[PDB]
């Protein structure tokens, strides 16, 4: 994997407020976007939801992902550039109450 694929990563990461590295058809990412948008009420424009299935870059991008941050599955969830984990990372923040001061600067 390329160091130019893997800034590319970074930089979308930075300059969104949540990054959601998704495939259309996992039940994982269904269950974490609907956390995210119809749950929690975060706007969609301060999320960006790549879909990797859909995209040329799809492989790269999720073996960036790996160097980066370790995890191999989608979802690939940063929240203000921090990295979160997968759909049981974000439902478990919600259980020990920790992720609604996460969202404060972004919502
Ligand atoms: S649905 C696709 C697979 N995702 C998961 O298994 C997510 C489970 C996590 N525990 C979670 O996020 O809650 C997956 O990523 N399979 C491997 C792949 O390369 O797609």
Do not use: W
């Not at 995210?36 to 790269?60: C, H, I, T, W, Y």
């Amino acid at each position: 994997v390329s160091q130019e694929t893997i800034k590319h990563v970074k930089d979308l990461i930075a300059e969104n407020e949540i990054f959601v590295a998704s495939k259309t058809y996992c039940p994982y990412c269904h269950a974490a976007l609907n956390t995210l948008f119809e749950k929690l009420k975060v706007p969609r424009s301060k999320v960006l939801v790549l879909q990797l299935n859909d995209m040329k870059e799809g492989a790269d991008i999720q073996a960036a992902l790996y160097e980066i941050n370790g995890q191999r599955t989608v979802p690939n969830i940063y929240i203000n550039g921090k990295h979160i984990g997968g759909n049981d990372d974000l439902q478990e923040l919600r259980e020990t109450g920790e992720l609604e001061e996460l969202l404060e600067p972004i919502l």
